[PDB]
Symmetry: D2
């Protein structure tokens, strides 16, 4: 099942364009100390498109070393080639990852059957737990709820889905249909500002961007819900809304890296084609961070 | 300037899991015999995500030797990492490609400045002509006409854009603003069913999927326009409509490969996550190809 | 406050193209007997565009007569002219309606300020409670949450909003911002399939189409939520989903009238430009009604 | 066939709450002096929702006497009730209007068959020429090209369509399919900034907002096209772009009325729920009108 609650989609810090593991380790310790229940390394938020294979090995191994088996480490490993995706999955397995996060193939817009065949191929060839990641605004393809349910029903190794389609109809149906196919199938929000409603739909938490900066608050949002305090969960959601929105005024992780820098955790460096946040975004983040008690 | 008229985004035929260069060459001669003005190899129509490094080199080298300088060979070489893109570009340059088609970074949704910096970084480090490729439905990002025009103004090496945003306002403005910044900047449609309108806007032709099966007719659509025969060009556009629509009932190149197979050119073989066309798709194609005289 | 829970947006039955008050009265008694908390007469679901002024008077008066003051009767009275809207509002007032439902002006796409001025003008000129009705898919204009909050803050007579924008971000913000402006401001869902999530957002119920056929079940959905049984509320929502969806496979109230006819309540008659449900829709409704225990 | 070229959707000037027929006549002469081929009175540009019955009659009667048969006067007469629409149509017919513009029923989202039945019901009961008006952004419904073509095929009295769906595929298909069903069926753009492309598609001109302020230039755009000068027509299109865009920065006719007021034609007076243009809008207009030579 991997986890319930908050899994942080952690940034990949750079300094002088190189991996900055000393800043990374400070960030991992902040997550651990604030009750986060998983780390997702090398997702979109960690600039997976621009981190090379040798760097991935170093980052994955170092994350496993710091965490000491306390929470699972889930490694982004999806590409738009089924063959190449398996290769990345087998690399994460060999490094000792606890699962992989595998985005639907981006850019080549596979059919629903193609998506099924992609995950099947991978599932039949690894012992690792696999999390489907649906994010149509980035990939150009949406996993239909029925397709996710078919994957749940058939592929024992696929243990859950990160649902980043923001449509509440999609969220409602993904949760309902997958859990009907397999009661233990996990459904985590892929959007911080949908976590509350995804919990209400009956899902399992969030694979979060906001938790990079506000881990305790995102943890509290889920924890209050799980404890039966719907209205207190909703209040956390409402208090976090400005931060949730600010972190996406430019493409993630541009804002979250500027935020982590303001907070003193990392240098504000990204790799091309990503570039640092505009002054307007930084100014907004500074204000919102201050208002939220994070600065 | 590369070319005006039709540039065929050619498929990559496979047979029993490997490149099928014999069928590829038949298809290349079919293009050349029918007046096509350029080949774009290893675009999305050419299943670029699933063609390995060895295969890319062989496919480009073979194309260059078949074509024998009669028309330019432009090689798809864009990824969502600026670093990796440059490598693919330099590889094409080393083989003797006449140009590269470089899609906007997909999945990571770079800002407009990031897009500019991406093309600037590559432009400064190759002597090849570069064609920007905008296809927001696949990539998750839209190159603004104003960004295209800045690119045209500043980057001598970027010679044009394949405009696959289907919005006629975008088509109108890309053509208008790029040519204002640089009169010889080329603008080719990236949608067959926008070619006619893009010509009417002041553009330079099309980088086509349909011309895989109907090269003479796409050539004619452009030729008639260019000769001043607007209504004749419109009539070819209208006659081709069913074929243009049929080739996108499932994600390209699933239908076009089925079509080429029906016509006896290639084996109907794709690589995961793509899968062969449905029976319903094949039925439509069989009927449309007959009506068009192609079967 | 009008009501919490379920307010039925009741159909206007016709026979031989005339108002059919005998069938209407049977339908009102069904609502009353099943615990509905309000009736909304002459909304979209009651074909307000095609019911003439003399008919409106008869229908409103007859509804008040049958209900005997047991629940409020809220009359649709919004048009796209501010002057004409007031006239309809004053007519409903004079007939003894308990409130009015006033859609944002459709077709002429007023500015946000225009919307404020429209509701202000009306509010300053009636003693009745006014419910704003936001339904951008029909009107071409969306009331921004901030605009609804400004109306809440300023116009004491505007007592709530029927929120039919299906976007969960809109629903979340409409509830949050209006209740922050005025704690007693009511927010009802305008979409049956958003009621659950609108309750979770902290809203007040639903102005329902589905309750025409399944009043007890929609009442149970809200009642369970209000009683603190989130999971039981969600289960009602899930069981009703097929019916919720079926009632909108063609424009409402085309499906709901076909459903009421299958159930024996009304003739399946609409006024032009509306026409009866297709056989496909009827077949679906028959199945879904049967599965739901309504047939 | 009514006309080819430009038909001005003329504003309805108000002064101190009443019709301003003196300014209206100045504006009518401005149109006639500058070669406009038709007037459309009481369209949405003419604030049809807020003009009362007495005022409609006076405005139509005055227009007919000013124009004195030089060009056709087509009267906006469509509502979302088939019954009421027919009344407005017959009223226009009684006054001596040359035609009626009949928008698809807004707000109630009729099915395609309902749309057909709506126009059939009216067509069978008037001798006037009827122009279908499709503007999905305002009405919530899109007339499918196939429905337009059935209408063209069957209803002798329906003489054309004002196509304000901005999607070039819709424009292409409406023109293609209607003219195939009936060669003399007229197709006019309902968006100024689509006129050029609609002409290129095979259409017959435009029912224009811009021509309120720039009648000669819209006439020229069409005239050049019709004379075979495609690039000259495109150049006028490009030169007019800023004005075309500026007139829709707020909902039409808010900007055009501000523009006409700047030019000294009318008082900048609208009826609720419309309100005068913002300072920012007026600033843009002042600048764009100057650059265009109109101020
Ligand atoms: Ca350790
Ligand atoms: Ca009574």
């Amino acid at each position: 099942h991997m986890f319930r609650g908050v899994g942080t989609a952690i940034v990949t810090p750079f300094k002088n364009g190189e991996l900055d593991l000393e800043s990374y380790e400070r960030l991992v310790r902040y997550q651990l100390e604030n009750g986060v229940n998983a780390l997702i390394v090398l997702g979109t938020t960690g600039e997976s498109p621009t981190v090379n294979e040798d760097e991935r090995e170093k980052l994955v191994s170092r994350t496993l070393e710091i965490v000491d088996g306390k929470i699972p480490v889930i490694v982004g490993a999806g590409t738009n080639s089924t063959e190449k995706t398996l290769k990345l999955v087998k690399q994460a397995e060999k490094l000792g990852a606890n699962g992989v996060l595998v985005v639907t193939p981006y850019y080549n817009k596979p059919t629903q059957e193609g998506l099924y065949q992609h995950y099947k191929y991978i599932s039949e060839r690894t012992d690792l737990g696999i999390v489907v990641y649906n994010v149509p605004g980035r990939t150009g393809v949406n996993v239909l709820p029925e397709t996710a349910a078919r994957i749940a029903a058939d592929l024992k190794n696929v243990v859950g889905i990160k649902e980043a389609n923001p449509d509440i109809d999609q969220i409602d149906r993904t949760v309902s249909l997958t859990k009907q196919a397999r009661s233990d199938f996990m459904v985590w929000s892929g959007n911080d500002d949908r976590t509350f409603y995804l919990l209400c739909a009956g899902g399992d938490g969030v694979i979060s961007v906001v938790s990079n900066v506000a881990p305790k608050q995102m943890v509290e949002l889920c924890a209050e819900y799980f404890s039966g305090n719907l209205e207190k969960s909703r209040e956390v959601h409402r208090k976090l809304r400005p931060l949730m929105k600010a972190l996406f005024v430019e493409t993630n992780p541009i804002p979250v890296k500027a935020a982590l820098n303001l907070m003193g955790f990392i240098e504000n460096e990204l790799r091309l084609p990503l570039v640092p946040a505009s002054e307007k975004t930084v100014e907004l983040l500074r204000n919102v961070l201050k208002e939220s008690g994070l600065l």
